[PDB]
Subunit: 253 residues, 2 copies
């Protein structure tokens, strides 16, 4: 009978606080693609839930000196949440410590920048320093760069790391703002870029996808919900409901 605890994070258009003059409470506070997803999962699998924003405001990465995780990943490891329903990338290092459903969305890292310039790829950024570039701190993009042995991406990480106090940000919204107000390119997931460039006609994706990954629902390692949620996602996909949800939340001359 117990309601599942669902950790999440604010990220447009996946999870947002509803706009209202009327003060809102509990789950009624939230809306977005991942909220619609959670509701559909709850009806298919027959559970109730309580949404809680991850307290540290992080997606999750491992501390390279003490070995501890943070963010939603740590919430799951510690059994403080039953599910993480968010744009949470399924990654090699995370799958070793938590479980994930199969993906509800597929994406890759790409670049958000202003229009009208000769920059066309990550290699173009890597070879210069006048245009600064960075990523969300303690997320999957940062971790990809931090771990990569690929020359272009390892050069980019050395720059990000050197300039971390300025170029690593706490949210995608902070990264967008840096693009809009300084000479800065943001390494951003492509699904989110698609949302942002439809609303900011002076911004564009630069190049293609650097990698390929999916977003999945996170569970603690060994949870029986993991496979059940995979099957429900696959149902939702085939019925057309994921595509409908994407259209709803994603909607220039």
């Amino acid at each position: 009978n117990r309601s599942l605890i669902v950790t999440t994070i604010l990220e447009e258009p996946y999870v947002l606080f509803k706009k209202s003059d009327k003060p809102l409470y509990g789950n009624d506070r939230f809306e977005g693609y991942c909220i619609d997803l959670l509701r559909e999962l709850s009806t298919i699998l027959g559970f109730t839930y309580e949404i809680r924003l991850v307290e540290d405001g992080k997606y999750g990465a491992q501390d390279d000196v003490n070995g501890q995780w943070n963010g939603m990943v740590r919430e799951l490891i510690d059994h403080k949440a039953d599910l993480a329903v968010a744009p949470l990338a399924i990654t090699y290092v995370r799958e070793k410590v938590i479980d994930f459903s199969k993906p509800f969305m597929t994406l890759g890292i790409s670049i958000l920048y202003r229009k009208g310039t000769p920059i066309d790829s990550a290699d173009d950024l890597a070879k210069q320093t006048k245009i600064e570039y960075g990523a969300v701190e303690d997320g999957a993009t940062m971790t990809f760069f931090k771990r990569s042995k690929i020359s272009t991406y390892d050069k980019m990480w050395a720059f990000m790391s050197s300039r971390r106090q300025s170029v690593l940000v706490k949210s995608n919204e902070e990264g967008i703002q840096r693009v809009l107000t300084s000479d800065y390119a943001f390494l951003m997931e492509s699904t989110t870029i698609e949302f942002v460039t439809q609303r900011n006609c002076n911004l564009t994706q630069i190049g293609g996808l650097i990698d390929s990954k999916g977003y999945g629902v996170g569970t603690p390692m060994g949870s029986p919900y993991r496979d059940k949620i995979t099957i429900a996602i696959l149902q939702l996909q085939e019925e057309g409901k994921l595509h409908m949800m994407k259209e709803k939340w994603w909607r220039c001359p």
Copy 2:
């Protein structure tokens, strides 16, 4: 020494092919392709040996309406006649209920292969007419998608395909391509395979976009301990750029 794993697969270019050789080849040495390269990488990461066997009935796998029984590679896993299926095997709702899959090594969707020079632009345009026949591989995921779909366009299409099945359902993608080339016929084909085919025959084209979204995964019997191990190995390979390199090698008008 540990028992070698029996790996079921199916001939499908450029995933799995017999090598061209004037010299007679034996055993695993007979085969090449994207999935063969994937299998080799998995074997070194996970430390197993293996024996490749072509699925005996020549099918991917679907469930019989009357007797409830599966066929193809899905059935070989259900019956423990193979340890793994390493092939372009779509992860689907109905299959995940009876076998296990790794997370995807490639993402794709159903689309349409047809000859160039047509006003037909979508599945809707095909469904509304009958002069141009259309169909799919018998007993695979595309056929099953149409047979199960409650979406109007696709249910209309399935009624036509089912009526005409002895003529429009084929036993391989190869046979579907030949029907496109030798009659007034459009083939419902997975997008990654369309990409391969249209790069080598400049008379053919994709029509419309993707009708759905799915992944290819390594199949295992339900409950297999290899499932999650192979997911982790695939995520490592992705991270490192090796899946991308393999796709470029095998897909390189």
